[PDB]
Write a protein that binds this DNA or RNA. Sequence first.
DNA 1: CCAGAACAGAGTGTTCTG
DNA 2: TCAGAACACTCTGTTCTG
Lengths: 70, 73
Amino acid sequence: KVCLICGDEASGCHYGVLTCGSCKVFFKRAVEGQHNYLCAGRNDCIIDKIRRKNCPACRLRKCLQAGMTL
Amino acid sequence: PQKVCLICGDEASGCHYGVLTCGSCKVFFKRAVEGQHNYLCAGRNDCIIDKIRRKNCPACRLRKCLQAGMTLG
DNA sequence: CCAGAACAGAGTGTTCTG
DNA sequence: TCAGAACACTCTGTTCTG
Ligand SMILES: [Zn+2]
Ligand SMILES: [Zn+2]
Ligand SMILES: [Zn+2]
Ligand SMILES: [Zn+2]
């Protein structure tokens, strides 16, 4: 019921991992697209519903560490 | 001789709200002080603010603006 | 249910003006 | 000189569709 990436309400099992929709479309867009994500902290940024927009790098990192794939 | 924004290190357009800055940090500061935003740092309140990452943490950006001495009067 | 498409908004940055 | 208006773009999130 809870997104393993940001803790928001999970819509379902997407790309191998229980997530919400925002993290679903984010993951696809992040992996295929050419983005210049760069962390401003220490690679341990808190990714929750409020702050997930802040550091796309760490968000993508959590997605990958969760095992998400296309 | 070229001037540098004291907030993000981008090219400063001039002295805005009391501090040498670019346009983006200017309008950002205005919108931030007046506007109702939910800025919250995801790190340790010491995020690196440069041209690439200034979009990342508005909280730390506003913090640098205030510590630089920016004001509306 | 799940993937992808598509529509809409927030936040941002530049150009123009006096 | 700098302040503010306004348009346009990027990124994101929800809704729609196959
Ligand atoms: Zn999520
Ligand atoms: Zn980060
Ligand atoms: Zn700046
Ligand atoms: Zn921060």
